[PDB]
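Troubleshooting log. The previous run stalled partway through. Resubmitting the same two chains, unchanged.
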Amino acid sequence: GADAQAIHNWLSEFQLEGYTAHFLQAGYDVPTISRMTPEDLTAIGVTKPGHRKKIASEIAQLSIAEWLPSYIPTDLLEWLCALGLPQYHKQLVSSGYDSMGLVADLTWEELQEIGVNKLGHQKKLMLGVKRLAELRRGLL
Amino acid sequence: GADAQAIHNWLSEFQLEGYTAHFLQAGYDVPTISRMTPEDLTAIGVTKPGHRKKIASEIAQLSIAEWLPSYIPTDLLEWLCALGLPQYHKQLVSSGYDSMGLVADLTWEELQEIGVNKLGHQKKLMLGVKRLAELRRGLL
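Second attempt completed without errors. Output:
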């Protein structure tokens, strides 16, 4: 099972499961499927036009923002969402930490007056910051 | 429920659940707990020495590598693990994409001879690359 189950469910919603194995063999998972084109479907063997047409249409309705499967937060809100901390966004922005590049240099001391007061939230965040800086340094 | 359930389970393994609510109130989740000190426990109100001693000991046994809760891959293997693609690591390294900084400039064409052949795997990876570069540009 796993993403097999997720795909098979999705496909089942319109009786086109049975194509499940196609997506698996090609190493697709739901979030990636969401970004397929028709040519992509053709390429993985969805060749019958009736079905390709349908599945494509069904894919344009698909949800999934956006940093899945990759797990690379491009922007601050995304990042705070992964970390499960979105309630702090507006505080951060009011205090001038409004981008990835900027949060990367957030420091422990700014923590009050920004108003993250729960200590597990402080720790979670500061760990994220730490790793984030580490990752940037990782480019040079 | 959610991480409530995860914590409460963990704590239950040694009859110290009942402290669950402490961890919640402080906005702790399991991966963050794993990194607490004794002073951290004291600070969130685990004040009885018997229990602080025990919970600390139990925390040193805790698993959880490492990019959870943050979701910031410091290094290539981590990143490929989030993406669910670790089977491609050695191929990537044999081809000189052996760091984050370097994969950030991986391009679609190197894909064969590196030997990612499944097209959902190609797409997943190249999306990751794309977002990864985007994130770096995000620092300047």
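Takeaways: Residues 108 and 126 of chain A are 7 Å apart (CA to CA). Chain A has ten helices and no strands.
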